[PDB]
């Protein structure tokens, strides 16, 4: 056993299972227009997201599971919040109110965000909360 | 420990009008003032919180303000069910200390009392009592007094009174008044009357009878 | 060779931004536990970014630096442009410092309008916080980078070394690509953003690392070329093998499908693999001295980063990587503890350790220092090893207890987001003390020289 | 949906001891304050303390340390309040509320739900049904187009007493007044206005019934003679 076989182990090793992992993402992504239900992804959805970005709340909350371990998981926050029919309304509620002022609390900022922005995030986060997420977050508390 | 007064005590205003209540603090308390709702039947509702931060789901109509020491509460456009008792509550400090509450009514049209006297039934009488009644019923504003004479002679012992809220359907209130002597006392004397005074008048309403018939 | 030179700067600059990481993570650490500490000045969001922002940049740094270096011995010649190295430096030490700024000097939305992301939105997404600008300003001083030392391995010998290390940084480039590719769609958002963190931090950069382990090892050894470079082949085909699926582990809960769950457990297992090799490779190669080297601290080096990247990034990475505990854990101060010792037991040792080598012989001092700023350097080993340990153990018992509270009840008896994060107090005091330990073993580090 | 059930009245004599209870359902118990607050007749609200389901931690009021023992009972979500050594001060409605916040450390916030309110009444009166009295106009004084009738419920304990004319069917024209006290024992009224053709031509009926003790009597309203 040398440096040559050593080599080669690497080379094609990897060569198959980049090409592997390039045929199951090619098979994963077509999928995805089910298991996200792309069919119900508005403008409103989209823009939601642009709103998440521009303002990084995964700077402070995680959605589904990923970003920063801060504040709480919003990717299921919808069912904890009045769910389905009055989530916009409190949604729209939520942000105004911000920052809370109690004392020595983790704080929220003031995003000073439209009717229309809120209204888009809340689509988003409403959205993201039906992705097929193979049964993730455990519970209501995410 | 600090302390709370609101103001005003009572207030009465009609549907669709504004009306904006006081709450001081004996100290500094920052923003934080909470205001709560209460109605006959119903659990306290939290209506704002940190003066003036309005709680979900209540309508934008009710607003507040202030900070340290002095802060209001404001009603845009009276509604029906807005109508009820408001306390407000300090949360800056342990402990958490409450103002004595303000009770805003609903005006109506002045209304004089139809007054009505009882004499002792005849069963309460055979057992040793006597209970004379007078219902001052229907009446508005709430104020008004009561007064007792027995044979010309007013009489202040031995009377309880009891009041009704507003009424929720004509919006007056009433009051009864319950004179407790014994049936030995009773029949002692010969006339006894009810005398009613309340701003629809001058002069008193007087009802009154003879022990005899 | 005299061109190693401009290896120099890229160090010292390095040391300078993680000095930056450390204050602005003790900043967070304080505000876990004071809630509003800085606010509404410096939100928690702001103080992450530059936090973990500082981190990404000071290690690349500290790669390029290393490069600049063990090239040119590897490569038989002077480096292809010394002109090139510096005016490199100061574009992308700008770049840094611009961007770091915009972060602190703006509200994160404001900046978005500011540098247009409106144009092409990439912006808002972790580790990709930085504005479109600076991503590309990124992207071409690395194209540079590659051109100036690529150039020096095409004429010069090619060692396994060098090309090895040279494919680590192709790839670490082609990669950042990614983070221009911002899907509208938010699985498939998620799904290539691993392709970048994971695919640089699980396997190109493990070749950037092995790489940079067996140059030091070559020299502080003596130790013969051919087994050291058959060993080096090794270690990445193992970190290849069981990376590239392994991404699978960060593919459980996000929206694609199921048939992950499987894949992604059963190729992680393996993934702690390279690790265990790295640290067999460290002892073996450094038991057999042809020499005794002046230097024991690099010695020491490489070893702890081969021990600490085997407990952070294996061992860690191992007890939470199995969907069905994965499933609990995901998205907790379990991952907190994780990311903290494996980042810094792979990627922050490893740069030290080069340093280590590569600076006394570059104020042309000599192959090692004086005894006294050798024992320093051994002392802040130490501090900053020891802290760690210590920092990712409360963070762990923080984790396995938000874990208890939080994940397992059912609807009803599980606590809060919140109200389990107060529980955990405690845990985030202690991980602020450990942080102290850190930054005064930083501290000692740098008074080595 | 957030909600506070609080436990029925309780009835107790001085020095005795006393325990009332608010299940809470629909929300993460451990993770909130729970509040108490005592509230008597025309007295202003006094916050009594606080019980932490999540590590059992409590707060009193200064004024309630004595008084006063808050516990939580994790697994059947609900929390208690123990009042002791019960003097005629104590007699009062008990709420309790959740803090709108949840954690350990806001302590002093304001509340979000409220119970409904337990009723304490402290007494040595004994159980005792009420003697009911018709009153029925001054007779040979009918003169109005509308006549007014009353009934007269005294001496009786404890409440409540439930009052209706001819059966519920006679509703409106209708005031019950507060009960009072005299003494020992509660005393409350009510009377009916109704077109003066109406009676003594048909019959008007006071029903009283007082379950505390068992009883249910019917006056019906005689003109006098
Ligand atoms: C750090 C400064 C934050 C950033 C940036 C964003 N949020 Fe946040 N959020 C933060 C904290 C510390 C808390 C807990 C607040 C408390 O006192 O209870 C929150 C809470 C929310 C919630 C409530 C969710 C829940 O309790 O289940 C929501 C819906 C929320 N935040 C939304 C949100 C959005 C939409 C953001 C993008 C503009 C955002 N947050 C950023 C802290 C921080
Ligand atoms: C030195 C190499 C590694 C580095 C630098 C590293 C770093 C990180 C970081 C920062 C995260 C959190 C990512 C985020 O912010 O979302 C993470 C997540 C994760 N890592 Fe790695 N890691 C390394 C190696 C490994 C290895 C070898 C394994 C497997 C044995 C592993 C398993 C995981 C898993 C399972 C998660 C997901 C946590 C969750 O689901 O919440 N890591 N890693
Ligand atoms: C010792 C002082 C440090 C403190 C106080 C600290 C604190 C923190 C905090 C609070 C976070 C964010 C957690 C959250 O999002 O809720 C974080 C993130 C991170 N830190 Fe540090 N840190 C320190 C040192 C270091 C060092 C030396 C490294 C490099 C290894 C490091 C690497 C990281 C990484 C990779 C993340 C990303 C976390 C993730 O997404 O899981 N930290 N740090
Ligand atoms: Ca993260
Ligand atoms: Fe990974
Ligand atoms: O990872």
């Given at each position: 056993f040398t440096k040559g076989m050593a080599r080669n182990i690497y080379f094609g090793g990897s060569v198959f299972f980049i090409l592997l992992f390039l045929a199951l993402t090619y098979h994963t992504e077509k999928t995805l227009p089910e298991r996200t239900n792309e069919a119900a992804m508005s403008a409103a959805v989209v823009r939601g997201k642009l709103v998440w970005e521009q303002n990084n709340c995964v700077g402070c909350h995680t959605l589904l599971g990923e970003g920063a371990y801060f504040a709480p998981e919003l990717g299921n926050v919808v069912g904890r919040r009045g769910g389905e029919e009055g989530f916009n309304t409190f949604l729209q509620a939520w942000m105004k109110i911000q920052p809370l002022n109690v004392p020595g609390r983790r704080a929220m900022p003031q995003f000073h965000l439209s009717e229309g922005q809120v209204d888009d995030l809340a689509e988003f986060l409403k959205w993201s909360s039906k992705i097929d997420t193979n049964q993730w977050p455990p519970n209501k508390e995410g | 420990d600090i302390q709370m007064t609101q103001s005003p005590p009572y207030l009465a205003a009609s549907p669709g009008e504004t009306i904006t209540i006081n709450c001081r603090a004996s100290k500094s308390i920052r923003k934080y003032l909470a205001w709560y709702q209460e109605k006959p039947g119903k659990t306290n509702k939290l209506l704002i919180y940190s003066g003036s931060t309005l709680q979900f789901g209540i309508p934008s109509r009710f607003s507040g303000s202030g900070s340290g020491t002095e802060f209001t509460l404001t009603i845009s456009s009276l509604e029906p069910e807005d109508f009820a008792m408001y306390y407000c509550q300090q949360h800056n400090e342990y402990p958490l200390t409450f103002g004595a509450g303000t009770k805003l009514e609903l005006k109506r049209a002045d209304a004089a009392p139809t007054v009505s006297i009882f004499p002792p039934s005849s069963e309460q009488l055979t057992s040793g009592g006597a209970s004379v009644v007078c219902f001052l019923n229907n009446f508005y504003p709430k104020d008004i007094n009561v007064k007792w004479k027995i044979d010309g002679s007013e009489r202040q012992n031995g009377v309880l009174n009891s009041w009704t809220d507003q009424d929720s359907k004509d919006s007056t209130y009433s009051m009864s008044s319950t004179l407790t002597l014994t049936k030995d006392e009773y029949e002692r004397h010969n006339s006894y009357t009810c005398e009613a005074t309340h701003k629809t008048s001058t002069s008193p309403i007087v009802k009154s009878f003879n022990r005899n018939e | 060779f005299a061109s190693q030179a401009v290896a120099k700067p890229y160090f010292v600059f390095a040391l300078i931004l993680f000095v930056g990481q450390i204050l602005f993570g003790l900043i967070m650490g304080l505000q876990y536990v004071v809630g509003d500490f800085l606010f509404p000045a410096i939100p928690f969001n702001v103080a992450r970014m530059v936090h973990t922002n500082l981190l990404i940049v000071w290690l690349l740094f500290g790669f390029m630096g290393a490069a600049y270096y063990l090239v040119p011995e590897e490569s038989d010649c002077?480096?292809?442009?010394?002109?090139?190295?510096?005016?490199?430096?100061?574009?992308?030490?700008?770049?840094?410092?611009?961007?770091?700024?915009?972060?602190?000097?703006?509200?994160?939305?404001?900046?978005?309008?500011?540098?247009?992301?409106?144009?092409?939105?990439?912006?808002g997404r972790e580790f990709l916080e930085q504005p479109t600008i600076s991503k590309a300003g990124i992207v071409i001083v690395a194209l540079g980078f590659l051109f100036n030392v690529g150039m020096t391995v095409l004429r010069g010998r090619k060692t396994a070394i060098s090309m090895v290390l040279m494919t680590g940084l192709i790839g670490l480039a082609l990669l950042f690509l990614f983070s221009f590719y911002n899907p509208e769609n938010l699985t498939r958002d998620k799904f290539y953003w691993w392709w970048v963190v994971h695919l640089w931090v699980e396997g190109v950069w493990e070749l950037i690392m092995g790489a940079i382990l067996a140059f030091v090892?070559?020299?502080?050894?003596?130790?013969?070329?051919?087994?050291?470079?058959?060993?080096?082949?090794?270690?990445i085909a193992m970190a290849l093998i069981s990376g590239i699926i392994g991404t699978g582990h960060h593919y459980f809960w996000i929206g694609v499908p199921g048939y992950w769950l499987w894949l992604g457990s059963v190729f992680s297992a393996l993934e702690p693999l390279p690790f265990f090799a790295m640290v067999l490779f460290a002892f073996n190669t450094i038991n057999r001295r042809r020499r005794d080297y002046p230097n024991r601290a690099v010695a020491l080096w490489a070893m702890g980063t081969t021990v600490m990247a085997?407990?952070?990034?294996?061992?860690?990475?191992?007890?939470?990587?199995?969907?069905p505990v994965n499933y609990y854990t995901h998205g907790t101060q379990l991952t907190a503890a994780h990311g903290h010792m494996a980042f810094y037991g792979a990627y922050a040792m490893i740069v030290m350790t080069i340093i280590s080598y590569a600076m006394p012989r570059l104020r042309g001092i000599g192959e090692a220092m004086d005894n006294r700023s050798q024992v320093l350097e051994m002392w802040g080993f130490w501090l900053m090893t020891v802290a760690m340990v210590f920092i990712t153990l409360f963070l762990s018992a923080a984790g396995v207890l938000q874990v208890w509270l939080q994940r397992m009840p059912a609807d009803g008896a599980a606590m809060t987001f919140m109200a389990t994060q107060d529980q955990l107090a405690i845990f985030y005091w202690l991980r602020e003390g450990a942080g102290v330990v850190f930054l005064i073993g930083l501290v000692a580090y740098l008074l080595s020289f | 949906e957030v909600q506070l059930q609080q436990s029925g009245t309780v009835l107790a004599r001085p020095g005795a001891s006393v325990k009332m209870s608010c299940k809470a359902s629909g929300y993460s118990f451990t993770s909130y304050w729970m509040h108490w607050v005592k509230?008597?007749?025309?007295?202003?609200?006094?916050?009594?303390?606080?019980?932490?389901?999540?590590?059992?931690?409590?707060?009193?009021?200064?004024?309630?340390?004595?008084?006063?023992?808050?516990?939580?009972?994790?697994?059947?979500?609900?929390?208690?309040?123990?009042?002791?050594?019960?003097?005629?001060?104590?007699?009062?409605?008990?709420?309790?509320?959740?803090?709108?916040?949840?954690?350990?450390?806001?302590?002093?916030?304001?509340?979000?739900?409220?119970?409904?309110?337990?009723?304490?009444?402290?007494?040595?009166?004994?159980?005792?049904?009420?003697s009911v009295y018709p009153l029925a106009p001054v007779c040979g004084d009918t003169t109005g187009s509308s006549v007014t009738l009353g009934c007269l419920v005294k001496g009786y304990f404890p409440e409540p007493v439930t009052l209706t004319w001819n059966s519920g069917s006679l509703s409106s024209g209708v005031h019950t007044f507060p009960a009072v006290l005299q003494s020992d024992l509660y005393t409350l009224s009510s009377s009916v206005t109704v077109t003066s053709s109406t009676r003594p031509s048909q019959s008007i009926t006071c029903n009283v019934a007082h379950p505390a003790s068992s009883t249910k009597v019917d006056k019906k309203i005689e003109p006098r003679g």
């Open positions: - | - | 002077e480096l292809y442009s010394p002109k090139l190295a510096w005016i490199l430096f100061w574009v992308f030490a700008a770049a840094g410092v611009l961007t770091i700024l915009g972060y602190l000097l703006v509200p994160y939305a404001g900046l978005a309008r500011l540098t247009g992301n409106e144009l092409w939105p990439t912006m090892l070559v020299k502080i050894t003596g130790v013969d070329r051919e087994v050291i470079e058959k060993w080096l082949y090794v270690i085997f407990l952070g990034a294996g061992v860690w990475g191992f007890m939470h990587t199995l969907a | 509230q008597r007749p025309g007295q202003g609200l006094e916050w009594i303390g606080a019980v932490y389901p999540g590590n059992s931690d409590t707060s009193y009021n200064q004024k309630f340390k004595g008084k006063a023992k808050l516990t939580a009972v994790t697994s059947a979500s609900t929390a208690y309040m123990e009042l002791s050594s019960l003097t005629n001060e104590d007699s009062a409605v008990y709420y309790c509320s959740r803090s709108s916040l949840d954690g350990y450390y806001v302590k002093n916030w304001c509340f979000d739900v409220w119970g409904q309110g337990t009723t304490v009444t402290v007494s040595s009166a004994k159980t005792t049904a009420p």
